[PDB]
Amino acid sequence: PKTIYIAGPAVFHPDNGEAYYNNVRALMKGKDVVPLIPTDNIATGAVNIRNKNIDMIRACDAIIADLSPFRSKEPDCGTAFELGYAAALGKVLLTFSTDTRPMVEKYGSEMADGLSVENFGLPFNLMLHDGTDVFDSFEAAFAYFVEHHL
Amino acid sequence: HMPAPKTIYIAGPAVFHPDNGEAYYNNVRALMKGKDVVPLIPTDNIATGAVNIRNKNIDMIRACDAIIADLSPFRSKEPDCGTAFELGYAAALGKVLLTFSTDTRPMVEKYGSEMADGLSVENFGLPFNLMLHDGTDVFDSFEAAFAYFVEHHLT
Question: Which chain B residues contact residue A128 at CB under 8 A?
C-alpha cells in the first residue's frame, strides 16, 4: 500500500484544508494508496510539526505538491521546502498549479519590483520543476500517479 | 595551501538582482577571504536552460558543508520559494542549515493578524514558514550568518 505526502497551502484556508483533504481522501479510497496529511493540526508546536512532516516525507513513495499562487504570484515556501526534501531523497515528484501561465505572463514583464522574472516558459521558480509536466489539479496529478506508479 | 576547506552554498534571491547578484556575491567572497572556507555560488547565470541550472545548483548543494539561505521577504512578506526548496534539499542531506532575513519579526506581526486575506498566519514566534526553521537562530544578514559559521563550524 503506497503512501503520498499531500503538500500544499490548503492548511491555511479557513477550514484548515478540510475540504481539500476530504477530496483527496475520497479520490484515493479503494486504490491501494493512502494519503499522508501534514501534521499542522495534529502535532503541537513548530518543532514537532516540522519533524512529523519530515517523517512523512521520508516515509512516502511520492509527493503531490500544490504549487498554486500563495499570497502572491509565487507558490508557498513551506511546500517548496517539502518538495526539495523529497527531491533529495529521490521520491516521485508531482506538482500542480491552478495557474500554469509562464512567470513572465503572470508578472507582465521580465522585471517586477526591481527583481528579474525567470523566463523559461515555466509557471514558477525553476528549482520546483524536474522535467515532468505541471498538472492542473490534484486530480490530474493523482491520475498521473496511478497510471505510472502502481 | 588549502586541501580541504569547508564549503558553503550561497542560497537566495540575489540572482534576481539587476546585476545578477554580483555586488552581493563579491561581498560574500570578500568576507571569506583568508579563511578555510569557500563559497558555492548559484549557477543561475552560469548555465543556460532551466534543466541545467537546477542540476548545477543541486550539484553544489550536494557538495556543500553548509547552506546560508537568504529568507528575506521576496515579492511579498514570504521568502523566495527557490531558496526554500534548496533549504529542504540541504536539510534532507543533513547539511548545516543557516538562515537570515532582513525582517525577523514574527509572521503575525508582519501580517498584523493571525489571518490575512482569508489565509491564516502561523503563530509560533517565527519570521516565516515553520518548515524553514530547524531550531537555529535566524540571523539578520549574510554577515551575521557567516560569522556564526566561523565561530562554530570553521575550525
Answer: 81-82, 85
Please report residues of B whose CB lies closer than 8 A to that of A38: none
Chain B: residue whose CA lies nearest to A75? B81
CA quadruple B45, B72, A14, A69: dihedral, nearest 10: -20
Contact B18/A114 with Cβ under 8 angstroms?
yes
Name every chain B residue with its beta carbon within 8 A of the beta carbon of A112: 75
Which resolution, in Å, applies to this structure? 1.7
**At which residue does the C-alpha cell 567572497 appear?**
B29
Binary contact (B81, A75; C-beta < 8 A): yes
Nearest to B16 among A49, A78, A116 (CB): A116
**Strand positions, DSSP E, B15-60:** 37-40
Crossing angle of the two packed helices A77-88 and A46-59, in degrees rounded to 10: 40
Contacts of A46 (CB under 8 A, 6+ apart): B122, B124, B126, B130, B133
Angstrom distance (rounded) from CA A124 to CA B78: 15
- Structural domains in chain B, CATH included, are 1-155 (3.40.50.450)
User: C-alpha grid cell for residue B133?
Assistant: 526553521
Q: Where are the alpha helices (DSSP H) in chain A?
A: 18-28, 46-59, 77-88, 103-107, 138-148
Closest partner CB to B89 (pick from A49, A88, A113): A88
In angstroms, rounded to a whole number, what is the distance separating the alpha carbons of residues A53 and B79? 20
Q: How was this structure determined?
A: X-ray
Report how far residue A99's alpha carbon sits from residue A94's, in angstroms, rounded to the nearest whole number: 16
Record: contact A128-B75, CB cut-off 8 A: no
Residue A75 Cα, gap to closest chain B Cα (Å): 7
